[PDB]
Amino acid sequence: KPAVELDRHIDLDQAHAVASGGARIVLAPPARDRCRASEARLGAVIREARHVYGLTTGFGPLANRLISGENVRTLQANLVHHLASGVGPVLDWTTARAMVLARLVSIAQGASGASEGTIARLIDLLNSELAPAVPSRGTVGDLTPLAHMVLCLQGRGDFLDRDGTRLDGAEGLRRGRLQPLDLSHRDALALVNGTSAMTGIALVNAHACRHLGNWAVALTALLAECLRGRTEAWAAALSDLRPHPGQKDAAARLRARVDGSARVVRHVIAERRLDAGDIGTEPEAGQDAYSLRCAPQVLGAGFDTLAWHDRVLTIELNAVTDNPVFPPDGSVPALHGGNFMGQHVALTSDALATAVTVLAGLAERQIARLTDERLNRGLPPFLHRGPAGLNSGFMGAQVTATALLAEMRATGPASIHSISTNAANQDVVSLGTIAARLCREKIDRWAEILAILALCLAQAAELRCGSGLDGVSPAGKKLVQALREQFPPLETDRPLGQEIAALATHLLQQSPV
Amino acid sequence: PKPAVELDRHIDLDQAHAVASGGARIVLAPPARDRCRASEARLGAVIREARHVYGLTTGFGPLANRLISGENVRTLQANLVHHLASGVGPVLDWTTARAMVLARLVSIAQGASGASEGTIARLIDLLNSELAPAVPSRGTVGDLTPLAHMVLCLQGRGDFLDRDGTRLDGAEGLRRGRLQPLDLSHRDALALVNGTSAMTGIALVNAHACRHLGNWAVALTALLAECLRGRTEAWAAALSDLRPHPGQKDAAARLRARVDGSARVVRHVIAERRLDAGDIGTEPEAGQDAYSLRCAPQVLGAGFDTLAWHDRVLTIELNAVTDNPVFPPDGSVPALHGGNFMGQHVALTSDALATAVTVLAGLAERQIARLTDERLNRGLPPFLHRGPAGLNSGFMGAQVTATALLAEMRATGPASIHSISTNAANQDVVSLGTIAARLCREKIDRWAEILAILALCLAQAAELRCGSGLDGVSPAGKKLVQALREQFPPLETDRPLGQEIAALATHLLQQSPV
Amino acid sequence: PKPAVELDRHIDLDQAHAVASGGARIVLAPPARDRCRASEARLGAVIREARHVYGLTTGFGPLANRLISGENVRTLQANLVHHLASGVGPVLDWTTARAMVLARLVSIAQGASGASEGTIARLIDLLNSELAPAVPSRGTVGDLTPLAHMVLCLQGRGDFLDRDGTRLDGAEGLRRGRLQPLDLSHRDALALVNGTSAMTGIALVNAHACRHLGNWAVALTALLAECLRGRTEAWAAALSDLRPHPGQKDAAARLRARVDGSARVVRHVIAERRLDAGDIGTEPEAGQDAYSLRCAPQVLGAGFDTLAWHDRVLTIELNAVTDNPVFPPDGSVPALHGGNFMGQHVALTSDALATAVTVLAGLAERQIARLTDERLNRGLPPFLHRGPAGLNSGFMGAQVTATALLAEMRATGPASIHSISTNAANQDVVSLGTIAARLCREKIDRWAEILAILALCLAQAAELRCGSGLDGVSPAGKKLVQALREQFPPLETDRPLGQEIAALATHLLQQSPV
Ligand SMILES: O=C(O)/C=C/c1ccc(O)cc1
Ligand SMILES: O=C(O)/C=C/c1ccc(O)cc1
Ligand SMILES: O=C(O)/C=C/c1ccc(O)cc1
């Protein structure tokens, strides 16, 4: 199993690898040294009785109640207690671990004061096959979910195995070989702080979107091979005229997908010189409908949105979103501010959510065109096999895709719903965790719509080019053959619900390569 | 000596707005003029050779399978403008309409549209005049309809707008502005009715307005701290470094600068204080401010980063060729057919910026709600009234009005998610970018009104807290209040504020506090 | 001989619109005049007895804890109107502003507001004039602000509007309308600045508009069936009886009536046909129409039931007393303090109606989308063009415009869910009913434009299918097309349709196809 050495910076791929259990995690010596130095600084702050939130004060508006050193253990224990008011389905295994990792990366910068033991508890969890069982709702953007995490790590909360099966606190510590979290150093705020939950949810969203984006491209390409699509619309020259990075990338990836294909139309229409005799109505127009012709532009805009989201998220993931914080340079004993305000993830998650809904709509319209006997240039209605009428093929699945898209559209941005709370102390809140969660739901819906499109295209390719897929590009052939290893052709109507669900799960974790 | 913007290949957003607003004249650089002349020649050849090209030898949309004889091209393109002129709704404002014209011009200047010298000159003339075409704001799915209306205007068959929004009939417009009627005899109509000009023009005006409102958001947040004994340590650079989002670092830096020299803010780092047994108890105030002050860098910062992304994308779009079909300058092929007119980029960025604006307007609204609350404003009069309490309510009405404006902003969401297959299913996916840009503009206008209310409240609060002399107020804060007081008197007794709010809002959208 | 509406206690929605639109004068019935005179006296007694009453012996909002001495009440109420005049945004249109005035009047007529005879006369005089107060549309969280602006107008300190929307200053309004300046010396200002008058006025105008648009939605659906050989069995009464929703039953019955006498629709019940062995195979067409025709009763019906609910609630609101405080006519107590001003009823019904309007607008848009599609319109020209195809595109632009208008409608959601605590947390929950009603109105306007496009398309389609003589077309269908053709010529060749769409839309909102 590969290992990710965490020093100061970790990229999104490395983060997902650790969160997903694909890689172990190790704290590099430099990071351990910085953290040990921060641990010492917290010790000094405490010995000096400096006025520091959480060390000598109550919480929120109650910070005006100063606390004596002898009562800090109780203080921080009750912090975790009152914050554990979360409700709703627990975060999935990968996401909960991504949250744990997000808190760890912040701590690794060396300004949180976390003790070596506390850090070890986070590392141990990530190297185990377990995840804390944390409720998904309750935060306005992430004290509540992190408090639940703390309780779990103390053996006072459930754990999740890779399959999602729940284990009680005691069993989790035993099975994962985890030691109970001990906060005797008064470093509880190093664990209950920042934007860890929304950041964890967001990095999982990022990974899923990369794979779905690859599928969106690969299916658009296969669509072209099933409907005699025109490749000139995907020409590099057009990209150069409207140089959006995401568009250029999309167009390039589309051209690569259909390289070697004999099923697409490559002629440049303007090369044709017309004669008087040609004047009249031709069978087909010289350009395709937008679901093919404008794929670079639509996909590209979505890709540029994801690029922005990922740039912002990379900074957030590697930042210290803690409050208070302890300056490594020792300029002041501690700083008090609001780096826990998750507005960055809130806004990027909302923007990505819109992009996902837009790209899902493209896929949905691609299915709608491919299955329409009036628009699919000669293919069977709904790509059925067997006697028509007696069989409807993908007619149900097509409507299901529309249903999934319509549902996605009903939910909008989470960020615009800030409500003054906490006795007006938190008079503005980010709702970033909700934003990231709403984006995740759309991503899941998009995966299902793409799954339906994938199943439709495997059938359409065979109906158009025969089981041998004559004229189909090497990439298209590889994709269909891969699908057919687990999903049989539709020779007669059958229930597709379970296959759609199974395929969607795959699309979210792997690309067509 | 009005400034001049020489257009060649690239033009930045500030230059673009200078031309659209009439602050600068525009000229086509010699290299651009030559590239355009070369493209003009290519179109001529394409037509002479009877090449199969959309709009030159074919119908439009799904009717493109209907080929057209060269003898009827004049009619073909004339009816294109005719059938597309189905727009409705209020006309785009003067600056925005001109921004659309500019956006089409910049695309043409790249030299791949085949536009004739006369056509280009007609666009430049409009931009150098004091006029703007009167074009309906609704009708496009993202921008043939508004552009077709523009064409009719430039032909004297449509109204024009003066800087005030007053309409002039076509003939009067060409006359007053010394504009020659647009002549499409060269069959270059597709150079004018194409691309994402409308949404791009609307968005470039949005970008400019947001820069100014962002500056007011920072300046007012700073003045708020001076009126509520705000703590500056939350805006420390060290915190920005720990969470290095560019927008946040900038917001914090600008906030610190605004209060530089102030004796009204609390600058002590609370952690420097060493506590002893006698300190253990309940203090009057907590050691940190409520989020509307403490988290300003993070909230404003996220908004600024969204605007930064919006502008990066918009800059590329403005300087791109969103035409279809296009005529490659290298001459590799007679023409290319694709979909560079799909405005998904402006659609998604406008929607993202709209959300950011709603979030920042919410911050300003909560700042007003805190400042005017006698239980939260640390000693200031309820609703900052003057005169006997009760008999006077001060800004009580204005405060509720700010909330009402914010609530309305929240009712409208992203435009992009509503794509609907249309044009006989040929345009099965559409961007709705023009709608997206327009919805963002509306929120920007509401944000300006909310900031205007906050500004008027702060001018009053500063005097109530520090005396008419503003003792202890920062140099920047003093200058801002003094400037406001030049046109907006103190509220000594209750009076209608509606007109003043609207007047100030107009100002905030065009100038920053300096 | 201008009709007259005599107000006593109850007025229906039609009478209300008749007065608001100036189609009828308004007179106060003898019993209403007496109830009001008695209430006026009760207000006098409350003041004489120094009863603890909001607005008479107290400040406003959270400032009500500040008690006021009788000698300062004139000033108290004057500043109330002053601080509340913080409205911004475009003014309410002539009819809607008058509807607001009427709403306040009807509440007062119940005799629990204490309004003096003069105050009542000022409202009546305004309604019987050709003017309306010029009132900003934004500023209320749900309607003190718009009503305060109304008060200023009636005192000659605010603008007025003529039927065309042209603005007149305060002096000119009082002069031209032959109105007396409003005098609040009786300390009855709270009888004018109170309740839900603005949202109720906006909503009642919405109700009238929806009735007409609904009639057009039915008429055009029927004409669509005559243009596409629609099957009438889907509109049979038997189906309505099996699923007894009132709105659906009514929709089906109105549809059948519209096509009565038509020889262009298919009336054969498919199940009557017995199939033989040689019938098995693929028929040209399916035995049932697409949903835009087959499910018209169900879709239109659900919208009609929503409007019915909206109207039932609105009727109660219009004829209710939404004031605070109130003076019990039964003399049980001097006054009651509560929250009848909370416009949650109009907020929720406006939001529900807005959704229904968007759904029905969607139906019309899809009907246009089907009718103009050569692959779906059963033999009609692509986009219903005349003249050579390609060279002409007909309604291709208008069809896209319809889609764009619908997409914009969808971007805005319910206003009610955005309640934000305001007024120093005193108004911790607000209705936003005024905003809700306004958002619904905008959707209604978009719906009218979409229906206008459909109407123009259908007139053309009817002539293309049945010839200029409309052979086989029902009497109702013929009347509608002929009526349209008196003002809107056929589209024999492509031409700008924007102005015609807008003109027709204006007509559809005020008159039904009869
Ligand atoms: O203002 C802060 O830094 C603290 C906020 C807070 C709000 C609710 C809690 O349950 C804990 C902390
Ligand atoms: O597919 C295209 O390139 C053309 C689309 C189009 C749609 C509606 C119009 O009115 C004109 C062009
Ligand atoms: O609570 C009330 O009845 C008064 C509310 C109110 C709020 C804002 C105003 O400007 C006037 C009255």
Side-chain angles (χ1 to χ4, degrees), chain B residues 66 79 82 85-87 138-139 366 374 391 397 399 401 403 408 410-413 418 421-423 438 494 497-498, chain C residues 66 79 85-87 138-139 366 374 391 397 399 401 403 408 410-413 421-423 438 494-495 497-498:
Chain B
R66 271 74 168 188
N79 291 338
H82 284 165
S86 57
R138 302 191 174 102
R366 283 294 86 180
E374 71 184 315
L391 291 177
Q399 192 268 314
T401 289
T403 304
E408 185 170 333
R410 293 188 177 190
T412 297
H418 302 295
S421 174
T422 189
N423 190 212
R438 285 177 43 243
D494 294 359
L497 294 167
Chain C
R66 275 76 172 186
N79 293 333
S86 58
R138 301 185 177 106
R366 281 297 85 178
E374 68 181 319
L391 197 56
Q399 190 272 313
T401 289
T403 304
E408 187 169 331
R410 297 189 173 189
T412 295
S421 175
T422 190
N423 189 221
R438 286 177 43 247
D494 295 358
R495 69 163 182 275
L497 295 169

Side-chain angles (χ1 to χ4, degrees), chain B residues 396-397 400, chain C residues 54 60-62 80 83-84 144 324 341 423 426-427:
Chain B
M396 190 157 81
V400 166
Chain C
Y54 182 81
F60 301 101
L80 163 64
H83 88 251
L84 285 172
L144 301 190
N324 191 61
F341 50 67
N423 189 221
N426 174 54
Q427 305 188 303

Side-chain angles (χ1 to χ4, degrees), chain C residues 57-398:
Chain C
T57 62
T58 73
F60 301 101
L63 303 182
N65 68 312
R66 275 76 172 186
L67 302 192
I68 313 303
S69 191
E71 62 273 13
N72 297 307
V73 184
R74 293 286 290 258
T75 297
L76 175 68
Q77 306 201 335
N79 293 333
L80 163 64
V81 173
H82 285 161
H83 88 251
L84 285 172
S86 58
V88 296
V91 299
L92 297 173
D93 61 55
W94 188 81
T95 305
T96 302
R98 286 163 56 81
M100 172 185 80
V101 172
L102 174 60
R104 189 88 294 277
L105 176 58
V106 176
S107 183
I108 290 167
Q110 306 312 309
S113 304
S116 65
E117 283 195 61
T119 298
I120 293 176
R122 298 296 79 73
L123 300 186
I124 292 176
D125 285 0
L126 180 287
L127 292 175
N128 290 322
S129 74
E130 295 295 297
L131 311 177
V135 170
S137 59
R138 301 185 177 106
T140 174
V141 292
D143 294 314
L144 301 190
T145 290
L147 285 169
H149 281 279
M150 173 194 75
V151 171
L152 293 173
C153 296
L154 299 179
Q155 296 181 312
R157 298 174 59 194
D159 288 2
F160 279 90
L161 298 171
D162 73 352
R163 285 187 174 182
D164 303 311
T166 65
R167 303 182 58 164
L168 310 174
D169 65 10
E172 178 52 31
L174 300 180
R175 195 194 72 51
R176 185 181 304 188
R178 301 184 186 180
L179 311 173
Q180 283 299 94
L182 176 61
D183 183 320
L184 300 173
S185 60
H186 291 78
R187 303 177 185 182
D188 55 337
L190 281 69
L192 296 181
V193 184
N194 226 317
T196 63
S197 312
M199 68 184 84
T200 294
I202 294 163
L204 75 81
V205 176
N206 285 346
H208 189 70
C210 284
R211 175 156 66 76
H212 290 302
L213 293 190
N215 285 324
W216 280 96
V218 168
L220 301 181
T221 292
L223 189 51
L224 177 70
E226 303 196 70
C227 288
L228 300 175
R229 295 194 294 277
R231 292 172 182 285
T232 63
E233 98 177 81
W235 303 344
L239 288 176
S240 293
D241 294 324
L242 287 166
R243 191 197 191 202
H245 287 294
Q248 183 178 318
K249 183 179 183 179
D250 184 54
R254 287 159 62 180
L255 285 167
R256 295 196 301 277
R258 296 299 304 182
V259 299
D260 180 64
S262 175
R264 287 289 176 173
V265 299
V266 175
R267 303 174 188 285
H268 299 80
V269 177
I270 70 173
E272 287 290 6
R273 172 188 176 187
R274 304 202 186 197
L275 305 173
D276 66 288
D279 286 315
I280 304 306
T282 300
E283 295 182 298
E285 303 173 350
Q288 316 180 80
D289 291 325
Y291 293 7
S292 48
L293 277 178
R294 171 150 55 110
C295 297
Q298 295 76 17
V299 173
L300 293 175
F304 289 167
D305 281 334
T306 298
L307 178 62
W309 178 53
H310 169 277
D311 291 0
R312 283 197 292 283
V313 174
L314 183 58
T315 293
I316 294 177
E317 187 75 344
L318 173 59
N319 295 290
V321 175
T322 47
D323 300 44
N324 191 61
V326 291
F327 309 99
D330 66 8
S332 50
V333 298
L336 289 171
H337 288 77
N340 278 340
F341 50 67
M342 180 58 76
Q344 204 73 66
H345 278 80
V346 171
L348 291 179
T349 50
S350 285
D351 282 343
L353 180 58
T355 301
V357 171
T358 300
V359 168
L360 272 56
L363 172 61
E365 185 279 332
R366 281 297 85 178
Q367 294 176 322
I368 295 166
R370 171 168 291 282
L371 179 62
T372 56
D373 192 323
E374 68 181 319
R375 288 181 177 125
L376 309 174
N377 63 17
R378 298 179 175 182
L380 285 168
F383 307 105
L384 316 174
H385 83 274
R386 284 183 66 179
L391 197 56
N392 288 282
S393 299
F395 294 92
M396 193 162 82

Side-chain angles (χ1 to χ4, degrees), chain A residues 287 290 293, chain B residues 54 61 83-84 144 341 423 426-427, chain C residues 396-397 400:
Chain A
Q287 311 182 94
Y290 293 7
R293 173 145 55 106
Chain B
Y54 182 83
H83 92 255
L84 287 172
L144 300 187
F341 51 68
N423 190 212
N426 173 59
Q427 304 190 113
Chain C
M396 193 162 82
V400 167

Side-chain angles (χ1 to χ4, degrees), chain A residues 242 244-250 294-308 351-352 354-356 358-359, chain B residues 309 313 317 342-349 416 431:
Chain A
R242 193 200 189 198
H244 287 295
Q247 185 178 315
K248 179 180 182 183
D249 181 52
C294 300
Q297 295 73 18
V298 178
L299 294 169
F303 292 169
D304 281 332
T305 300
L306 179 60
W308 177 52
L352 179 57
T354 298
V356 169
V358 167
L359 270 57
Chain B
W309 175 57
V313 172
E317 184 78 337
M342 180 57 76
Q344 203 73 66
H345 278 80
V346 169
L348 294 179
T349 53
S416 296
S431 80

Side-chain angles (χ1 to χ4, degrees), chain A residues 420-437:
Chain A
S420 170
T421 183
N422 187 221
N425 175 56
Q426 301 189 305
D427 50 352
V428 286
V429 289
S430 80
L431 307 179
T433 330
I434 294 163
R437 284 179 43 243

Side-chain angles (χ1 to χ4, degrees), chain A residues 48-53 56 60-61 63-69 111 195 232-233 235 237-239 241-247 268-274 278-294 296-298 300-302 304-305 308 311-313 315-316 318-323 325 327-328 331-345 347 350-351 354-355 357-358 361-362 365 369 375 409 411-413 415-420 423-429, chain B residues 49-54 57 61-62 64-69 112 196 233-234 236 238-240 242-248 269-276 279-295 297-299 301-303 305-306 309 312-314 316-317 319-324 326 329 332-346 348 351-352 355-356 358-359 362-363 366 370 376 410 412-414 416-421 423-430:
Chain A
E48 288 159 24
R50 303 286 191 164
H51 184 185
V52 173
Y53 180 87
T56 62
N64 66 319
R65 276 73 172 186
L66 303 194
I67 310 305
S68 192
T195 61
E232 80 168 286
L238 288 177
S239 295
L241 287 169
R242 193 200 189 198
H244 287 295
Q247 185 178 315
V268 175
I269 70 171
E271 300 281 39
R272 177 188 178 192
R273 300 163 185 270
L274 301 176
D278 306 315
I279 304 306
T281 305
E282 301 197 304
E284 317 184 326
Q287 311 182 94
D288 293 326
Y290 293 7
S291 56
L292 273 176
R293 173 145 55 106
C294 300
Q297 295 73 18
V298 178
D304 281 332
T305 300
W308 177 52
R311 287 197 287 277
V312 171
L313 183 57
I315 291 176
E316 185 78 341
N318 293 285
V320 178
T321 41
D322 299 43
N323 190 58
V325 65
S331 49
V332 297
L335 294 168
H336 289 78
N339 278 342
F340 49 70
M341 178 59 69
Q343 205 71 66
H344 278 80
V345 171
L347 294 179
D350 280 342
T354 298
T357 299
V358 167
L362 169 66
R365 283 294 87 179
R369 171 168 291 279
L375 307 175
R409 295 189 177 190
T411 298
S415 298
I416 64 169
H417 302 293
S418 181
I419 291 172
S420 170
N425 175 56
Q426 301 189 305
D427 50 352
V428 286
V429 289
Chain B
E49 305 167 352
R51 302 287 190 165
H52 183 182
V53 179
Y54 182 83
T57 59
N65 66 314
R66 271 74 168 188
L67 301 186
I68 309 301
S69 176
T196 63
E233 75 168 296
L239 286 177
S240 299
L242 287 166
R243 192 204 192 198
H245 288 297
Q248 182 178 315
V269 171
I270 65 171
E272 301 192 315
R273 176 189 183 189
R274 296 173 181 255
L275 303 172
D276 68 25
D279 295 313
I280 305 306
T282 300
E283 305 204 311
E285 300 286 329
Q288 307 179 100
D289 291 322
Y291 294 7
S292 49
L293 272 177
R294 172 152 52 112
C295 298
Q298 295 73 17
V299 173
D305 282 331
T306 299
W309 175 57
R312 280 197 293 281
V313 172
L314 183 63
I316 292 175
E317 184 78 337
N319 289 284
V321 178
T322 45
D323 295 48
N324 185 64
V326 293
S332 52
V333 297
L336 285 176
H337 289 71
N340 275 342
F341 51 68
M342 180 57 76
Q344 203 73 66
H345 278 80
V346 169
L348 294 179
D351 280 339
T355 299
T358 301
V359 166
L363 169 68
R366 283 294 86 180
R370 172 167 289 279
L376 308 175
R410 293 188 177 190
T412 297
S416 296
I417 66 168
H418 302 295
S419 182
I420 291 169
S421 174
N423 190 212
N426 173 59
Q427 304 190 113
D428 50 354
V429 287
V430 296

Side-chain angles (χ1 to χ4, degrees), chain A residues 372-393:
Chain A
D372 192 322
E373 69 179 311
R374 287 191 170 96
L375 307 175
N376 63 20
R377 294 172 172 179
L379 290 175
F382 304 105
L383 315 171
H384 84 276
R385 281 186 66 182
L390 293 181
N391 289 282
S392 302

